[PDB]
Structure formats: structure tokens, C-alpha cells
Amino acid sequence: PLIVPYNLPLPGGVVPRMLITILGTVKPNANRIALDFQRGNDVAFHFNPRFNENNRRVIVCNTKLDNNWGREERQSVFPFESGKPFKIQVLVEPDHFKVAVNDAHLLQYNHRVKKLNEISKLGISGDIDLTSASYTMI
Ligand SMILES: OC[C@H]1O[C@@H](O[C@H]2[C@H](O)[C@@H](O)[C@H](O)O[C@@H]2CO)[C@H](O)[C@@H](O)[C@H]1O
């Protein structure tokens, strides 16, 4: 449905209790998915399932400040499956983004970018069909 890369405005930025739900389907032979929670040019939270990083599936999380990626946080747990529908839920908590994929907690990403209200765009890219990207307050 939705065009990828998709930019989901997060009006007024993120706030704890904001739940962002991304439904899509990983393309066959997907290489990557990326969610980029952006604070302007900075990526407050880059959530980057990599389907083939040295023949491993890994989730790389990072923050890009001033065009410099920070310390990657890597999660070996990889709930995405090429070709398959997924649901990513990013719950903004006070101290971290909490990411659940297909209703299973996947990872937390401590806020490195502290101005949550300035994290006002979510870029959704990569090898997905994007069915829906929405947010709500829980
Ligand atoms: O850190 C997220 C960021 O990673 C970049 O790739 C890194 C790669 O993860 C690392 O193993 C290597 O040593 O450096 C690369 C360049 O910084 C991706 O290019 C970028 O898109 C993000 O996913």
C-alpha cells in the first residue's frame, strides 16, 4: 500500500506512551529494513534489521548525530523473515524506545537523543512492502 521509503511525521515528536505500529511485509530477498527516527538530520534511533550481514541476520540499532553513527547496538535476535508480514511496534518509553516485532519484545534502545519532542519523523525504508505506519498513545 504505502510507498517505501515512507516518512511518517511524528507531530511534536515522540513522547513516552507513543506507540508506533508499522505493518508490512518483508520483501523476498530482503536485505534490510530501516526505521529511522529522525531529529532533523540526526537519526535518534536507527533500527536496522540486516538480513545478510556476513551471512548473519542482525538488528543494528544506532543513532546518527551530525552525520556520524554512534556505537551500534546489535541484536542477534531476528524476528523478521524474508517474505513475511511483520508488525513492528515501537513504544516510546521514558528512557528507551522499546521495539516489539510481531508482538514479541525485541529490544530496547536507550534514548541517546534526549529531545524526544524533536524526534518528529520516522523514516521507514528498506526491503519491505509497507502496509501501514501509524502511531497512537497508549
Ligand atoms: O550503525 C548503523 C549504521 O551502520 C552502517 O554500517 C556500518 C556497519 O554497521 C558497521 O559494521 C561498519 O563497521 O561500519 C558501517 C558504516 O558505519 C550503515 O551504513 C548505516 O546505514 C546504518 O545502518
Residue located nearest, by CA, to atom 23 of ligand 1: 48
The grid coordinates of residue 95 equal 528512557
Residue located nearest, by CA, to atom 2 of ligand 1: 62
Residue where the block lists cell 545478510: 52
- Give the method of determination: X-ray
- The single-letter DSSP state of residue 27 is P
133 within 8 A of 32, measured Cβ to Cβ: no
Ligand 1 pocket residues where CB is under 6 Å: 46, 48, 60, 62, 69, 72
Cα of 110 vs centre of ligand 1, distance in Å, is 18
Residues 6+ apart with CB under 8 A from 128: 4, 24, 25, 26, 27, 30, 33, 86
Resolution in A: 1.7
54 within 8 A of 72, measured Cβ to Cβ: no
Q: Which atom of ligand 1 is nearest to the CA of 50?
A: 23
